[PDB]
Amino acid sequence: MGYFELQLSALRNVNGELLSGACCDCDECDTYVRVCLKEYQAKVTPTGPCSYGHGATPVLGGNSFYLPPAGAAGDRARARARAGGDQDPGLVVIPFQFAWPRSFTLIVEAWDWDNNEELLIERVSHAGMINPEDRWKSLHFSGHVAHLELQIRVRCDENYYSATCNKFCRPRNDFFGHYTCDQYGNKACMDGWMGKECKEAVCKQGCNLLHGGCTVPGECRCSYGWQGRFCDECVPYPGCVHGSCVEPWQCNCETNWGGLLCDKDLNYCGSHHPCTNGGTCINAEPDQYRCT
């Protein structure tokens, strides 16, 4: 989810001494750096172990040495994607899979390699607060023996966001969604897609989505009972002749037309009539009458 970085750039012990006042023999030390990441507290500044993680460098040089800068690129794959023998000492990487508490206590030590605790060169502490910012932060110190220049930074892992590295967002384009992720870790639906999970597609423009749908963006496939390019006209009762529909399977007959399929003339005589001698016809039952 995230990792704490430490970039050592300079360490200076001109006298070549230990913190105990003794000599590294004042013919030079073999200096390596330990890093202790633990809980930040209140008043009870001394309690034991590195609960948030720990790190160590190999011997980097002698009494005093200066380390090159790195590169404002490859930052992610240099610290979190390499095989054994990570050939960059001075970069201490402490990954974490919990919610970053922001408040922390950093203890950085300088040691002498010999082959024991009486070989500590310099111990340095600093408790404070830091947020997952992609910007380094400089820390300089001047102890009784050594002088150190550090650069620390907290960083959310790729696809993890927010100031606690807990919000997750990984880009996707498959069965379960079509989207990317943004600055703040929210989903950005790819063009043609919508919805809370960028799962629902955008259909043909004009498609009545009350009765139509689409599996691929740009389609318009109607439901059962609706038809047309836009799925907006109902399918009437098959056999409907003098009728219409508003809902599917309806055969709403027209004026003076009746029966199921609207094929029965109720006003037989006011239309194609049968009367004789200018008498008088009257409508009587579908397709029937009386002409007197």
Residue numbers in the entry: 27 to 51, 62, 65 to 153, 158 to 334
Give sentences copied directly from the paper behind this entry:
The Notch signalling pathway is conserved across all metazoan species and plays key roles in many aspects of cell biology including cell‐fate determination, stem cell maintenance, immune system activation and angiogenesis in humans (Guruharsha et al, 2012; Bray, 2016). Aberrant Notch signalling results in a number of inherited and acquired disorders, including various cancers, and it is therefore a key target for therapeutic intervention (Hansson et al, 2004; Groth & Fortini, 2012). Binding of a Notch ligand to EGF11‐12 of a Notch receptor results in a series of proteolytic cleavages, with the final intra‐membrane cleavage by gamma secretase, causing the release of the intracellular domain of Notch (NICD) from the plasma membrane.
Here, we present the first structures of Jagged2 (N‐EGF2 and N‐EGF3), which has only 58% sequence identity with human Jagged1 (N‐EGF3), together with the longest known structure of a Delta‐like4 ligand (human Delta‐like4 N‐EGF3). Two crystal forms of Jagged2 (N‐EGF2) (green) and one crystal form of Jagged2 (N‐EGF3) (dark green) were solved, including a total of seven crystallographically independent copies of N‐EGF2, and 1 copy of N‐EGF3 (N.b. not all of EGF3 is visible in the electron density). All of these copies have been superposed on each other by alignment of the DSL domain, showing some flexibility in the hinge region between the C2 and DSL domains, and further flexibility in the hinge regions between the EGF domains. However, the angle between adjacent domains can vary subtly, resulting in the ligand structures appearing to fall into two groups, one group including Jagged1, Delta‐like1 and some structures of Jagged2, and the other including Delta‐like4, and some structures of Jagged2.
